[PDB]
Amino acid sequence: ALRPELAFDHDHIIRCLMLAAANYPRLEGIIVQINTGYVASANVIRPVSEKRYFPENLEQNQSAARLVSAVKARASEADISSIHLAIAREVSPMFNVHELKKIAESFEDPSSIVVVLEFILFALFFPTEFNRIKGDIQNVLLLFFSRWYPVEYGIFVQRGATYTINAAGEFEFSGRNEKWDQALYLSEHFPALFSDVP
Amino acid sequence: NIAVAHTDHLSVVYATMSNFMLNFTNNFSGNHATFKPDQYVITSPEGSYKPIIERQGETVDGLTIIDTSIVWPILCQCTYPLVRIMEEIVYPDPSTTLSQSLSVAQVLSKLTLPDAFINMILSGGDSVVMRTYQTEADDDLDEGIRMTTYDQYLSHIRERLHITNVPDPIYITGASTPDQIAASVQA
Amino acid sequence: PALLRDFTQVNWLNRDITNMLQQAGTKYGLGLTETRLDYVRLVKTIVGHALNIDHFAASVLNINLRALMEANVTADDRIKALQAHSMISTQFHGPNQGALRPELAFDHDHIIRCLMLAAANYPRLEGIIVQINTGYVASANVIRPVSE
Amino acid sequence: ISVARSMRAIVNHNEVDRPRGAVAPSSYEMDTGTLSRNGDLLYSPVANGQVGIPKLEVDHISFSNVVSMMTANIRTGDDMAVERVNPDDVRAINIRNA
């Protein structure tokens, strides 16, 4: 059945989308908002009043006090907006390259493993966004490794903190320890922690 | 306790959101080891260079920085329709998100247009200035040897040659037979 | 005076100035001339305006700016002082302003000179530095007087 | 006595092509020249392939010059914000290692 309207001009739309992406900072947010709304309308997730952060007794336990204070340090209060955003940005296009909200973790006490899980969960719930900020994650995990697995860490870092892929597809590690910057995300380099080369 | 709510519900929300009109980029291939974004620029011989993805650091929008701590509420303090005991699942009308995708696309074409339009003019369009020196007496101004400046060629001609998959036209030195020029012109 | 050209009613002067300006060796101009955009932000940073000004002042202004830009010391380097005046292993973050917020490098040599000099002239300088350190101890809250 | 004199008798004479003793400004007052890569000012080259003479090399006064100057985007001396973050436990801090 005819619809007396002009055809969706696929090609022109992608071009103008690209120009807008080049010139209009607000584009990113616009698209996100659309996606956020969808999540908000799908009613897939709402915050609840009570927090199920600790197993019963462990919150009030006197020797748990550090781990509790660790978990409480990471465990932020829920907001529908921040959650829906977190969900939406897995699908939304990224334009300004993303950055991790940097964490200062020495990883002395065992409880510091929270931060490690905080990343692992992030990689599960949000593989995409994780993939954007992963080098910035690697800067933190390297402290965790050097402190927890010093010898494996010296071996790994001797191989190189990063690598590039050559045209044949083989990995090529730097041989050098260098701190990651997101400036590199757009370059040929990849964090070496995520190479999965044994 | 919540994993069903993630895999058996929210996953569909990702699957449909992935088909939305405005999620045009390929965000991630499922392999951390090898994935890199496809990277594009608007760019001209005239000298403009405008990356689509670029790293400027934290922006006013608040989209750039990511607090990963958001995972904790998602586990330890958020209810879901699936959990729990039975609750009706919402399937949003396409029309809302769709129609606002469309309204955004029209806002965008309307917005980029004056920029695109002015530049079409500053470009000077699909034409090039060209001197035509005469080589014989009784030559009309139309007749003679056509020639143009390199800047015009870069600006208007060369990109089209690149876009048509043909060899770059030969340079002409002192040692240049007409037959070579013919091979080049036909090339 | 190069602006008087074809505007002054005095004929000989306009002729003379036209001759000087039509020489190969001399060419008046009223910049902007040299733009310099950042490598990352791609916006203009230092620009070269050909002002009507004496060459001495221009040379001093340029000396100062050249100092500030050639240092390659951004505001981010202030963090290195902050670490020094902070409890060991404080971390500092952000915002990576970059080349867009340049500053002069901390002049180590000149400061140590002025310090040794003042310490020669002003022994009481001791009591100033002590006072600073005293305050830090006082704020670190390591030890408090008590009635017991 | 008139060592500072740039110009003189900016008037027309009704008979002669220029009044006697009239003084045109020196060409150097008007050679804006170029800022050099060093930051040194220079007059324009006198002939092709020559670098220009630095304006400070010589005693003429040049009243047009290229002063470099920062635009609004560059800013310096503004106070700068940061997230300072304290050590989690004072006992864990490492005073020592090289």
């Binding site: 921040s82 | 920085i65 958001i70 | - | -």
Partner: peptide
């Protein structure tokens, strides 16, 4: 504590 997608600045260094 509360979620915040941005640097959580507190210090203001002087030049």
């Amino acid at each position: 504590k509360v979620i915040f997608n941005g640097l959580d600045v507190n210090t203001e260094v002087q030049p």
